[PDB]
Amino acid sequence: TTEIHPSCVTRQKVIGAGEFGEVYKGMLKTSSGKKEVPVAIKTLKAGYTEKQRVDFLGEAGIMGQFSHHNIIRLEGVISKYKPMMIITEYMENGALDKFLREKDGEFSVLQLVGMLRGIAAGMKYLANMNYVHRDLAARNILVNSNLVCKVSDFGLSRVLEDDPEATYTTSGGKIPIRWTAPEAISYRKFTSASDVWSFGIVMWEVMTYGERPYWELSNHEVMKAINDGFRLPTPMDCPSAIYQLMMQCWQQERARRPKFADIVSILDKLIRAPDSLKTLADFDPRVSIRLP
Ligand SMILES: Cc1cccc(Cl)c1NC(=O)c1cnc(Nc2cc(Br)cc(C(=O)NC3CCNCC3)c2)s1
């Protein structure tokens, strides 16, 4: 984990404000002053607690363990000087859910499926590294200028044995239940198979351009529907094979869900033979329009 000297970091614009600190777009001078790259910079403001420090630096320490095209890349940290900083590659199009909501209907099916393949490859890498994400959702995916999607949001509570915060978000809040598999909701059994359930929800988010899973249903109403066997209906214009794959991610019995390797393989097969994506699942209309 590379310690960066503050003289190598310039902050150009705020892109996110927080209670704990801010996130900036900036530049990082690297390679002994011979290179310069755009970066995102997150700070931890003075007065942070020991827990806030361990969580903050812990996320960087985990990110530094990974080297994959579909996982956000860590440049390094500033810990010896204040404010402390985590510095990553800069993802020009921000969070995937917001990106899709601002680009509604503008991508092809093949582009959407390609985004899902990248996310699945990142998740396959994480799962094979024995990292369970626990909060996989489009809001935790970032998108670059070239439409590459990368998994982000990481924390020590996911790796430490019997962490008292293992069932919370990386901020200490409640993991939004509508992305979470039933056995993780009810028994706190988080595994890569519960991440697969979450990935299925991400597939639905992508194919709907960022719709809210289960629409207006409350959390208890979502739990009621899932445990009754209800599942999200097919998005509009969604390939049958893609909807079948998300349905398999949502099998109640976790051993019946695909592994991330299966997901990557299936998505690859569909992209390579794109006529396979022309068979569309029937979209259930929610409004009767009677016309001649
Ligand atoms: C710095 C850091 C520390 C710890 C964990 C992580 Cl994942 C990070 N890195 C980051 O948060 C980020 C990396 N890239 C980011 N890109 C980003 C985020 C946000 Br908010 C907004 C924008 C951004 O300004 N996006 C444009 C402007 C608005 N519409 C189109 C997208 C970019 S945030």
PDB file of C-alpha atoms in Angstrom, residues 92-104 107 115 143-145 147 149 209-210:
ATOM      1  CA  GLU A  92     -15.498   9.846 -15.243  1.00  0.00           C
ATOM      2  CA  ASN A  93     -19.144   8.717 -15.343  1.00  0.00           C
ATOM      3  CA  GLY A  94     -19.593   8.117 -11.607  1.00  0.00           C
ATOM      4  CA  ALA A  95     -21.980   5.647 -10.036  1.00  0.00           C
ATOM      5  CA  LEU A  96     -23.683   3.203 -12.392  1.00  0.00           C
ATOM      6  CA  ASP A  97     -27.247   3.633 -11.094  1.00  0.00           C
ATOM      7  CA  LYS A  98     -27.163   7.410 -11.548  1.00  0.00           C
ATOM      8  CA  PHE A  99     -25.398   7.079 -14.905  1.00  0.00           C
ATOM      9  CA  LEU A 100     -28.106   4.771 -16.232  1.00  0.00           C
ATOM     10  CA  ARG A 101     -30.865   7.066 -14.890  1.00  0.00           C
ATOM     11  CA  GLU A 102     -29.311   9.986 -16.795  1.00  0.00           C
ATOM     12  CA  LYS A 103     -28.903   7.885 -19.988  1.00  0.00           C
ATOM     13  CA  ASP A 104     -32.297   6.155 -20.103  1.00  0.00           C
ATOM     14  CA  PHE A 107     -27.504   2.010 -24.840  1.00  0.00           C
ATOM     15  CA  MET A 115     -21.530  -3.937 -18.565  1.00  0.00           C
ATOM     16  CA  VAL A 143     -18.261   3.709 -14.740  1.00  0.00           C
ATOM     17  CA  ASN A 144     -15.381   5.213 -16.704  1.00  0.00           C
ATOM     18  CA  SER A 145     -15.371   7.239 -19.934  1.00  0.00           C
ATOM     19  CA  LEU A 147     -18.192   2.458 -20.268  1.00  0.00           C
ATOM     20  CA  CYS A 149     -17.849  -0.896 -14.985  1.00  0.00           C
ATOM     21  CA  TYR A 209     -31.735   1.841 -16.660  1.00  0.00           C
ATOM     22  CA  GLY A 210     -31.629   2.179 -12.905  1.00  0.00           C
TER      23      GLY A 210
END
